[PDB]
Amino acid sequence: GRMHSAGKGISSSAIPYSRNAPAWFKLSSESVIEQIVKYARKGLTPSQIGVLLRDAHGVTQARVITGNKIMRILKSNGLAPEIPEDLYYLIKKAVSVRKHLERNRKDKDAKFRLILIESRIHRLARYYRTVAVLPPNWKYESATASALVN
Protein backbone atom coordinates (compact mmCIF):
# COMPACT_ATOMS: atom_id res chain seq x y z
CA GLY A 1 0.00 0.00 0.00
CA ARG A 2 1.55 3.25 1.25
CA MET A 3 -0.57 6.10 -0.10
CA HIS A 4 1.24 9.40 -0.67
CA SER A 5 4.34 7.62 -1.93
CA ALA A 6 5.09 4.52 -3.97
CA GLY A 7 7.21 3.12 -1.17
CA LYS A 8 6.44 -0.47 -0.30
CA GLY A 9 8.23 -1.10 2.97
CA ILE A 10 6.99 -3.61 5.54
CA SER A 11 7.53 -2.51 9.12
CA SER A 12 5.27 -3.13 12.11
CA SER A 13 4.57 -5.14 15.24
CA ALA A 14 4.43 -8.91 15.08
CA ILE A 15 1.72 -9.40 17.71
CA PRO A 16 2.13 -12.58 19.82
CA TYR A 17 -0.28 -15.50 19.66
CA SER A 18 -0.29 -15.09 23.45
CA ARG A 19 -3.54 -13.15 23.83
CA ASN A 20 -3.25 -13.71 27.59
CA ALA A 21 -0.18 -14.18 29.78
CA PRO A 22 2.73 -12.65 30.25
CA ALA A 23 2.93 -15.53 32.77
CA TRP A 24 6.06 -14.05 34.39
CA PHE A 25 4.15 -10.80 34.89
CA LYS A 26 2.97 -9.84 38.37
CA LEU A 27 1.10 -6.64 39.32
CA SER A 28 -2.59 -6.25 38.54
CA SER A 29 -4.95 -4.30 36.32
CA GLU A 30 -5.03 -1.61 39.02
CA SER A 31 -1.29 -0.94 38.73
CA VAL A 32 -1.07 -0.18 35.04
CA ILE A 33 -4.46 1.54 34.89
CA GLU A 34 -3.28 3.99 37.55
CA GLN A 35 -0.09 4.30 35.49
CA ILE A 36 -1.98 5.15 32.30
CA VAL A 37 -4.26 7.65 34.02
CA LYS A 38 -1.55 9.52 35.94
CA TYR A 39 0.53 9.72 32.77
CA ALA A 40 -2.62 11.14 31.16
CA ARG A 41 -2.64 13.78 33.91
CA LYS A 42 0.97 14.46 33.01
CA GLY A 43 -0.51 14.83 29.52
CA LEU A 44 1.10 12.17 27.36
CA THR A 45 -0.31 10.49 24.25
CA PRO A 46 -1.51 6.85 24.24
CA SER A 47 1.38 6.27 21.82
CA GLN A 48 3.79 8.03 24.18
CA ILE A 49 2.21 6.29 27.17
CA GLY A 50 2.27 2.83 25.62
CA VAL A 51 5.86 3.20 24.42
CA LEU A 52 6.96 4.43 27.83
CA LEU A 53 5.13 1.64 29.68
CA ARG A 54 6.39 -1.07 27.32
CA ASP A 55 9.92 0.23 27.91
CA ALA A 56 10.70 1.25 31.49
CA HIS A 57 7.83 -0.79 32.91
CA GLY A 58 7.02 -4.36 31.96
CA VAL A 59 3.87 -4.19 29.88
CA THR A 60 3.92 -6.20 26.66
CA GLN A 61 0.56 -4.82 25.56
CA ALA A 62 -1.72 -2.75 27.78
CA ARG A 63 -4.87 -4.27 26.26
CA VAL A 64 -3.92 -7.81 27.26
CA ILE A 65 -3.13 -7.39 30.96
CA THR A 66 -6.14 -5.01 30.92
CA GLY A 67 -8.91 -6.06 28.50
CA ASN A 68 -9.15 -2.50 27.16
CA LYS A 69 -7.15 -0.25 24.78
CA ILE A 70 -5.35 2.81 26.20
CA MET A 71 -7.49 5.55 24.65
CA ARG A 72 -10.55 3.71 25.91
CA ILE A 73 -9.16 4.00 29.43
CA LEU A 74 -8.49 7.72 28.87
CA LYS A 75 -12.01 8.39 27.60
CA SER A 76 -13.32 6.20 30.44
CA ASN A 77 -11.73 8.40 33.10
CA GLY A 78 -12.64 11.50 31.10
CA LEU A 79 -9.18 12.10 29.67
CA ALA A 80 -9.92 11.96 25.94
CA PRO A 81 -8.90 15.20 24.23
CA GLU A 82 -10.89 17.18 21.63
CA ILE A 83 -9.85 15.44 18.42
CA PRO A 84 -8.03 12.04 18.09
CA GLU A 85 -4.25 11.65 18.11
CA ASP A 86 -3.48 10.98 14.42
CA LEU A 87 -5.73 13.81 13.17
CA TYR A 88 -4.15 16.09 15.76
CA TYR A 89 -0.57 15.36 14.67
CA LEU A 90 -1.49 15.64 10.99
CA ILE A 91 -2.92 19.11 11.58
CA LYS A 92 0.09 20.09 13.72
CA LYS A 93 2.45 19.06 10.93
CA ALA A 94 0.46 20.88 8.25
CA VAL A 95 0.63 23.89 10.57
CA SER A 96 4.43 23.81 10.84
CA VAL A 97 4.80 23.22 7.09
CA ARG A 98 2.41 26.06 6.35
CA LYS A 99 4.46 28.40 8.56
CA HIS A 100 7.59 27.30 6.69
CA LEU A 101 5.87 28.16 3.41
CA GLU A 102 4.71 31.52 4.76
CA ARG A 103 8.42 32.09 5.36
CA ASN A 104 9.47 31.36 1.75
CA ARG A 105 6.94 30.88 -1.06
CA LYS A 106 9.81 29.97 -3.36
CA ASP A 107 9.69 26.38 -2.03
CA LYS A 108 7.24 24.53 -4.28
CA ASP A 109 8.28 21.28 -2.60
CA ALA A 110 6.59 22.47 0.59
CA LYS A 111 3.50 23.31 -1.45
CA PHE A 112 3.28 19.79 -2.84
CA ARG A 113 3.84 18.30 0.62
CA LEU A 114 1.28 20.64 2.20
CA ILE A 115 -1.27 19.50 -0.36
CA LEU A 116 -0.53 15.86 0.46
CA ILE A 117 -0.67 16.33 4.23
CA GLU A 118 -3.86 18.32 4.08
CA SER A 119 -5.44 15.76 1.75
CA ARG A 120 -4.69 13.09 4.30
CA ILE A 121 -6.20 15.37 6.95
CA HIS A 122 -9.40 15.80 4.94
CA ARG A 123 -9.82 12.10 4.14
CA LEU A 124 -9.18 11.12 7.77
CA ALA A 125 -11.53 13.76 9.10
CA ARG A 126 -14.13 12.41 6.68
CA TYR A 127 -13.72 8.95 8.19
CA TYR A 128 -13.87 10.27 11.75
CA ARG A 129 -16.95 12.33 10.92
CA THR A 130 -18.60 9.27 9.41
CA VAL A 131 -18.24 7.37 12.69
CA ALA A 132 -19.72 10.21 14.76
CA VAL A 133 -16.49 10.82 16.72
CA LEU A 134 -16.43 14.22 15.05
CA PRO A 135 -19.43 16.59 14.73
CA PRO A 136 -20.95 16.09 11.25
CA ASN A 137 -19.94 19.61 10.23
CA TRP A 138 -16.31 19.40 11.20
CA LYS A 139 -13.86 20.60 8.57
CA TYR A 140 -10.21 21.66 8.50
CA GLU A 141 -9.16 25.10 7.36
CA SER A 142 -5.72 26.58 8.00
CA ALA A 143 -6.73 29.93 9.50
CA THR A 144 -8.55 28.09 12.28
CA ALA A 145 -6.20 25.11 12.61
CA SER A 146 -3.46 27.46 13.80
CA ALA A 147 -5.47 28.10 16.95
CA LEU A 148 -7.03 24.62 17.02
CA VAL A 149 -3.64 23.03 17.68
CA ASN A 150 -2.67 25.62 20.32
Partner 1 sequence: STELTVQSERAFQKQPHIFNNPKVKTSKRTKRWYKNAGLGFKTPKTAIEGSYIDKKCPFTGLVSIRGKILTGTVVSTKMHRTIVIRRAYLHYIPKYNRYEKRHKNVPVHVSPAFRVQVGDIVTVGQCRPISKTVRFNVVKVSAAAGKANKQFAKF
Partner 2 sequence: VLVQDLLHPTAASEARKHKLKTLVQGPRSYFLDVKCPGCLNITTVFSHAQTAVTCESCSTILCTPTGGKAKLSEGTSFRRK
Partner 3 sequence: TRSSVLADALNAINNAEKTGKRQVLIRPSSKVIIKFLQVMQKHGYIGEFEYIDDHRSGKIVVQLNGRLNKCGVISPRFNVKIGDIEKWTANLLPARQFGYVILTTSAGIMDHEEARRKHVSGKILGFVY
Partner RNA sequence: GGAUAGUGGCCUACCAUGGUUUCAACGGGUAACGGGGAAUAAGGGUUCGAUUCCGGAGAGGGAGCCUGAGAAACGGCUACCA
Partner RNA sequence: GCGGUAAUUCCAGCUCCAAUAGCGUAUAUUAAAGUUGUUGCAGUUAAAAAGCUCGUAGUUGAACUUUGGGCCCGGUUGGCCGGUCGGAUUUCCAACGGGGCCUUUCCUUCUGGCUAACCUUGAGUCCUUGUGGCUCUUGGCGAACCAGGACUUUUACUUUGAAAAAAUUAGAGUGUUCAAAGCAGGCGUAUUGCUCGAAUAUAUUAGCAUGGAAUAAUAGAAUAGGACG
Partner RNA sequence: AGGGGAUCGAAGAUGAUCAGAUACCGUCGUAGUCUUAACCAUAAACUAUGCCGACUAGGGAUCGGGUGGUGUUUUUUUAAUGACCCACUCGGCACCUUACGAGAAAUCAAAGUCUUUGGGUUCUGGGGGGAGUAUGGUCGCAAGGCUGAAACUUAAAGGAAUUG
Contact positions vs partner 2 (CB under 8 A): 10, 12-17, 24, 51-52, 54-58, 60
Q: How far is the CB of 131 from partner 1 (least distance, A)?
A: 10
Name which of 36, 94, 100 is nearest 65 in CA terms.
36
Q: Does residue 82 interact with partner 1 by CB under 8 A? A: yes
Q: How far is the CB of 48 from partner 2 (least distance, A)?
A: 9
| Residue 126 host element (H or E) | helix 108-130
Torsion of CA 72, 35, 85, 22, to 10 degrees: -70
By C-beta, is 25 or 139 nearer to RNA?
139
Q: Does residue 43 interact with partner 1 by CB under 8 A? A: no
Alpha-carbon distance values, 146 to 8, 22, 117, 137 (Å): 33, 44, 15, 19
Residues that bind partner 1 (CB under 8 A): 78, 80, 82, 132, 134-136
